[model samples]
Target chain A: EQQSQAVAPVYVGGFLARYDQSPDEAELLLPRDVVEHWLVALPLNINHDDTAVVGHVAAMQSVRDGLFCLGCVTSPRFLEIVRRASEKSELVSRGPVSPLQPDKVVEFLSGSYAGLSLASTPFKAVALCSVGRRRGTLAVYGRDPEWVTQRFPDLTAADRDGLRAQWQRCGSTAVDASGDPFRSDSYGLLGNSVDALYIRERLPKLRYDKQLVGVTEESYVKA
Target chain B: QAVAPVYVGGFLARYDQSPDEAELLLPRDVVEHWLALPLNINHDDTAVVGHVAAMQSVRDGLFCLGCVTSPRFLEIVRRASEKSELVSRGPVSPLQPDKVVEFLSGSYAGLSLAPFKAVALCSVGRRRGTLAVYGRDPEWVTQRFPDLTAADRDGLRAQWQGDPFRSDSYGLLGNSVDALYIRERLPKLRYDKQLVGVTERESYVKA
Candidate 1:
């Protein structure tokens, strides 16, 4: 093993959880551009094959050491006390993009965690994923496929061509026209034409999230 | 991996040949921000560590990743870069490196006239500075130094060595480092026909 380079320092929040996989694996699962842009530089365990894999941050947690990934959402649901209040975050005419969509995923891990004794850290931050292929791709958080398609000019044509070509190639036997799975291989990104967009979403809560976390003008406006 | 080719800021600089050096000559942040972009596709790759091989590839292309020449230590390009279609937009100054930074960097404030999305920068020093080759269009960059004509260009090089002011000899200043910084806004987010919110102005505005 290539031991480790400078490990990420500890953070007050926690490392942004990732769908831990090798760079090669990431390349296969994520949009090609995303693999080259974001994951390539990360400190991850490398394998010889560098195959494909998918990632999902099943849960968020704070880490004591190494790069704290701060904020992100690759999967579904909350474990507890997770209150949601996406005010003004209504249905859209849809020009919005990733991490900042009408259906944007806003998580607030600000209060006391079960494992830790800290409280009211309000350690706030917001995250966005124009993750192209920085598409309406962000809307995928809400499964708004069309929203993802519109913002990306190239992906539009490419999606059509990519899907049509793959559909023909994959035909009846294929479970997902996106790709065919092998022993361990999986669809890297939803599609091959996925452009890449990045800079991870930090743990910071947006103005709206601050509301959800139950922070009020009265809470911090004291003289 | 393909980085989101955001143009932020840049400098125009030259690569001294006999001494064999490529100097982008900008502040450290500008160089890093610029390089971390689609500045490179294969070498000096956004994903690849900016190691020896990366530097070597820069020498070959002469623009984009190879074009960045500051921060001293990460300076890897050994020779001048030739012009290419992918050469950056214009002479630009870098920004603070954030969302506003990304929106503002590499972009000119004036309204656009070109049907094509060309935001030209550094008009004054476009084609005559130590790194003016960058300002020039693709046709003129021709090739790198140590080839033939560079000998004469080197003779004319003395006027521009580390000098901040513009140079007289076709804008080559004394030992100066040409630079540009850029970050992109990506294409403006658009509407998907399938979605309810497809057009502009009317949707977000409460009016």
Candidate 2:
């Protein structure tokens, strides 16, 4: 493609689909393409949970359409991406990429995030740059109610919705909340919501009522 | 020193940087910022490859959009614009990106050309511009380009020599089928993905 560098995770082979296959060139795909790919990949027969599928799509669309367009994914996994990135960047690894200490989680909970982490918050550099979501309703349980209310004092609910709407259009929204559209994004990324969590210790082993495209982990390994 | 929230374009500065440790400042500083304009955004004066590189920076979530007048600002614009003029045989786009970028709201708030870069936002028929599908990824995107018979592919290849909308400005080496088909339907490529987490295109995971 003309913009050779512009590529994010999407279909390819059976993976990067739609044809045009060749080595030197790239064929950038969209969120739906990735979604479709996963839909086919997930192990399921004709007999499957229908709402699970709807819920998964709804969740992805919600994130694509939700706060900051940061939808369909959650905390611990997001943090793991950061830990992997940090290791690749030469920062010392904390081990197993699990158990993101309670203290640190508390710190991240209180930090400001409109996309760019505020200095006052525990905004780790590597973490911010490596987070990406495919599809699911990412729960925000931000942890710090007081700081969030005060921080968003300058922004109205409509303002937040306006920004969120634009993000779904762009499929990504990183804007500021304190009325500084540039300062930080107060859209819907977990960090943006006092109701969301960016890091956690584990993924609960609970089954959803329906067949999700790839919402719940098919399986998990502690390592 | 604690930095006050000074935002330029959703480029981030809202949070209070207390405890004033340098670690807090790292998110903005460590990840280099780059600029991304679609293939048609700027004229040939804008180098296609440079723009591609900048967009790639965000794909990995390593760079934020930073063509504003700030650190490394000149390089982002300069590199993307330099080759455009040299190859197109015209004066380069002054590369005064700030003027164009400032107009877009989140152009500063880490808005990137990462996810769906160069993937065409609007689709055109026979170079006739009409908007089509949106964020519609790599797989499902084929639906928009239905008639890909060899004849149609041949027609696109003929235009490759000098397509009016710049379907082949990146200096393709003749038989690039992948490049040919991707641009056939869409008139403008857009972006996505980097919100909740970074699902690297490399890490195509499954059971």
Candidate 3:
């Protein structure tokens, strides 16, 4: 029997939604059993376009606590984009609710779904978007100083120390919905920006059903 | 904030059949939204493990399926050994015309029961995927794995890796003679008898 270990490529994982916590303005809640089936090996595209697939979500896990994705990003072009964005010190962002409104704000009626809950919906696709919702809630990945410093040739000592300290203490900028407390170390963040990242809002046809619920437009984002 | 219960059933969407001969074939269909349908045990209403949580027809042959909470019957499944079989049962029923009229054509009044009488689970019978034939007699096991021979047991046991539920490429159950053969050496697992209810078809004690 041959047991082999393969070196992994750049990988990313995040919570599509938190279990009981509504981490945004929408007040939408995701329960423990919200995922019907974990869709794996799906393309991880750029800005929801199938033409610009940059990576793939290798696996997903629906636990009693949250729904998670184990994704690996392989495109060098996309990696450079994320790298440049991280160097600019931008944070990963979130997408708006598709269609700008829920088709049916209905509750679960019977079975194990009987309650004030939205039914589990399968993901048609998972995407990365440039523009994000005004009051975005997708958790942002942390910046790695070594990668950042190597990419940029003109960083001062103060800047290097500052970034190292910031990254060390910052951890993942994840709310409950991002599977923050439980994200494993085997994976890394997709990017290090506050306004660009992959999300479920790119497709509107299955948003509510997939528990990719949206937040309000008029909410506040403080300076 | 009220939280939803944990479900234990699976998707109600369509899936492609496997080319492998080791797996079992449990056909699935794309019907109307069957959310909130009862998940019975062996099609017995009294023995429910969970129910349908989410669903929406996706494409021509597919539907986005959702969570099935196993809040009450977690232990019912937990006790089953890794070698035991996990099967899905769907007793489909007819849709109510009045409810349909009220929902789509009328005021969108509310939801109705799924066209399925119930989705069930049990040790025996069939659906889609492989079953554990470990506890049954040798003749019963041979009926399913006709080609399996005595020497194949060691290799089959090694391949199965002691997991009860093995998924195929599509995430449905995978097949291996090992799934059927390894169980013969182990003792048959039991279910919690106290939890089952609705034993009779309920034609009525009114009689």
Candidate 4:
């Protein structure tokens, strides 16, 4: 059998919506923020060459497509941004979420990133779940301002401008001074100094939690 | 049905002392490569073809015996046989093709060894067509030639590919095309011969 000379790229996407909503409706409403965060944290370091980097992005996007339960909120605009970023990253587009399910999303997340031990200190724990479509939800969790600064030192300014653009486009506040724009209780679960400490001290425990998300949808999704 | 004999060729090489028999001294690497076989001390039926005999007290004295069946077997046998140190038993015929075939067919019955329904022999002669030697002993064929390689047996098979029912034909009597040639070509054939008195060495040394 012939093997490809280059490793395939991995695609990743984070969908955000209010608690207990359909993702399809939310997808149309909030596209900018989703696209902005994905672009900012593209995990370029994980891959050396362009092919591998593109492969990683493509893999992540595929996982994102089926990552939410039906009735969970997803913004079309967010998906569009994901598509655009995938194209920019030289990744193949895997299309939109189909009847998104929470358990399926969790399964995708666990399986796609099986080998990688991506740090939760910067993003806290990445969650794949369903949320209300109408109410905006913060998809990106686990705030590590330091990591963001080191990777994309310019993102600090870009983020401010991105939030302002998003607020204007969606007619909602993009973020506060603390860099949190979405109004979701899931934010507390991530983005705290204590949360970062817990993630480091109990990495194994964090993996268990990630695993639990796949076992039962309710644990991960906003019911 | 005719029985084919088993042929065995013996080539003995003698060394002055117990000699570093661990390393392959003769045939060189090219010859070994050309022959596409290894000179191993182990008595495994599939790989190495012979036994090593060491005589008493001649410092570093060693005798090596190489055995094979068929003409190709003799070819390798001849090469090794040429390097004999003490006694060389030869390219000799042991069992005739008809008898060997019968014995092996009886011994292995349900197994692969079975006697040939017909026999044929093609010798290089003035007539050069086909020669029929009926009622020949399988041991006689092997006794005639003491050194033959597996390749020689293969060559003999190719030589007699067309003609059928010729007496003493290696293919008709031996189990396989190569088998008959091996049986007919090698000499001093013994079913129970074992290699004695050589210390087998390890391939690698622990650092």
Candidate 5:
């Protein structure tokens, strides 16, 4: 049945209540004593919808002054969502804010019930897609060769050699009038001159598809 | 499947060698390496129309000769006037698998000066052929062999053990194992597109 590697650990957590303050719009503020007691159960849904069960919650903890529900998801649909996030990010969720006492915490843990719903965004610390290259830079380019090297720190030595050679071939005039090709403004010059300006105009802007789990940011983010 | 003759690339002034500056030149060696490569229609690995028969180094530039063996592709080729054109698969450096140096971007018929790293491979599905796992992401490669670098271009050649780098060489480098990793880790950004038709004479015409 290929049952070995179908599950992935995910954090379905958020502030269940903000103690010492009243509940704001979309915020579930309750006494820490109450939140520490009761924990939600299995069959988490999307945006509190009873039908769209995405996964099951296994561990619950009242940590960092918020509710943390650790669970494993096997649903292909939700798994794809986690993959897109690439790493640690946030996802919103909501359910009936259970207000209970400390003695009821164990009773609630021992009891059976429906789980919490997760929002459509924020997938935290789950290496789905590794980062590509080093990273990007800010707008505008400086003339110094060192400036170029610092910005493109991840380019290997071979890349520097090939790029420098091409840079010299493209236009030696744009760069410094010296023997060393590496000490030039080739990155900026080549980009400004050789790169096509029409690609942006021709190809339609890309729009990636994603599922919408209707929930406010207030439901997940700290207030 | 019916077969039809077709030419690829080697059109437009900027693409070929010229008095005016070119972003990149189509040298004989680079064009020669393209021989026998699968001519995947619109860069889709699954929709391989045919393989390149030969590459001609004309005075202007380089062009390849190939025969479309797919009957449905041949029909489009016959009906097509100039709407669709051949977009050759770009080079993805072993060091940077995420980036691709494309040619014939927008209206300009020249090599792309910039690397388009954001673009994803919209593949059909899992492949069973030996050459199926041609492109693997840099992240996956690094995870397996963290120390492997540009220097390994020659050192890692032994991994091939007499096989060509473009072929079964990857088999020795745990290609099968990484194939499964790619399946589980990477996102399969699947999408569909309709083939309008293929251009007959204007092979280098941008689509």
Candidate 6:
């Protein structure tokens, strides 16, 4: 009997944000999962040493934006599954005499992730060697207001409350005023109209959020 | 106050096969700045090695692409030249087999001679031109030849009886045969006279 298999659907996870001064500005999107997968798979295929692989992973993690977050893997036991697959592929590609042991594979992945954690910060220092002071900022945004609100309760708490007030201020045009804050950044036309109002009021509201996060403190200055 | 140690830099050669002007490839100025020490042209001169060893001791780590004439040597020289704009006006000829043997014999005589012998023989079979040792160590290298060391040159001359060429006559006299005979009886005899000469250099250092 002949057997057939269906092609698996590829689901890509990513994030987006905007940095325009205009209220109706377009967002900058970063697909972090795509970058991470390539980071691990490309070098493994090229037969690089575990140390080199870890270094490359650290470099990618360092450059990733501050809004970086990981969502559900959908597959059961995701980390274990990825580890086993990496181990099997490494063993097959390197053959018996190669030094890429399974333990090294596991160690490489764990060490790389650990290094990434160390590299992650809200802001990175930019410098011109001996010439000038360093300055830069990383802004993160997404549809999941809860994700941002949870991590930055100090910055978002007032913004969340103000969003509810702004929705009422819009009066009859505000659909489901209770859900307005979450839906304001949606993809549709109605979401775009709400974005105009939110952007205008959001700046003053963000001051309270920043104060809550203690971002105005001297230590928070971009080095 | 402690006196700073003296440092010496050595020359690095770059050989190119393509038609691109060698100057375009080699770095000039960096070499000029880093290579502050007087150049040692003698084949047997150990100055470069000594200097590198001293630097290594101080820095706790050795620098890459030093005085050793490894394959990477030329590339490093080329890169240094490019960064510093210093002209490297040395030999641009492709490495000759005999030159490699002469350099290796003089620089690393303490190591095994078998590897050098193999390289020389292979190079000869491929018809590369022979290299000469233009430095002071030539005398030291000449004494190390297995045949010259085992059999006294005086005895060989005496036994030959003015014969320009001799056979294995000496080996047969000593329960077996002369040194010449012993060499022939072996499965592989490195017959190149130059190889025999360079190999002799190894014995002089030890002596």
Candidates in descending TM-score order: 3, 5, 1, 2, 4, 6
lDDT string, candidate 3, B1-207, tens digits: 011232221122224434233343223442433325565433445444445433333222122111224433332222211112111111113322121111111110011122556544333222222122211122322223333344443333332222122211111011111111112111111111111111102100000
Ranking by lDDT: 3, 5, 4, 6, 2, 1
Instruction: Using TM-score as the measure, name the better of candidate 1 and candidate 4.
Output: 1
The fraction of correct interface contacts reproduced by each prediction comes to 0.00, 0.00, 0.00, 0.00, 0.00, 0.00
- What DockQ class does candidate 3 belong to? incorrect
What TM-score quantifies how close candidate 2 is to the native fold? Answer: 0.16
Residue pairs in candidate 5 whose N, alpha carbon or C atoms collide under 3 angstroms: A37-A105, A88-A124, A88-A125, A89-A123, A89-A124, A90-A122, A92-A119
Docking class of 6: incorrect
> How big is the positional error of residue A29 in model 5, measured in Å on the Cα after superposition?
20
Q: Taking the tens digit of each residue's C-alpha lDDT, what string does model 2 give over A69-156?
A: 1221122323332222222211122222344332222222112111111011121111121111211111221222222212222224
Question: What is the lDDT, from 0 to 100, of the residue A173 in candidate 3?
Answer: 27
Model 3 chain B: lowest-lDDT 10 consecutive positions = B198-207
Residues A164-205, candidate 5, lDDT per residue (tens digit)?
453234332211123221211211111211121212211111
- Each model's DockQ score: 0.01, 0.01, 0.01, 0.01, 0.01, 0.01
lDDT of 6 at B130: 20
DockQ of 5: 0.01
- Model 2 ranges off by over 4 Å: A1-113, A116-223, B1-39, B42-147, B162-207
| Model 1 spans > 4 angstroms off | A1-54, A57-135, A139-223, B1-156, B159-207
Give me the candidate number with maximum TM-score.
3
Q: How far out, in Å, is residue A36 in model 2?
A: 47
Report the Cα lDDT for candidate 6.
0.21
TM-score, chain B, predicted structure 3? 0.30
Please give the lDDT score at residue A76 for candidate 5: 48
User: How many residue pairs clash (N, CA or C atoms closer than 3 angstroms) in each of the candidate models, in the order given?
Assistant: 59, 48, 26, 106, 7, 20
Candidate 1 TM-score restricted to chain A = 0.22
Candidate 6 chain B weakest ten by summed lDDT: B112-121
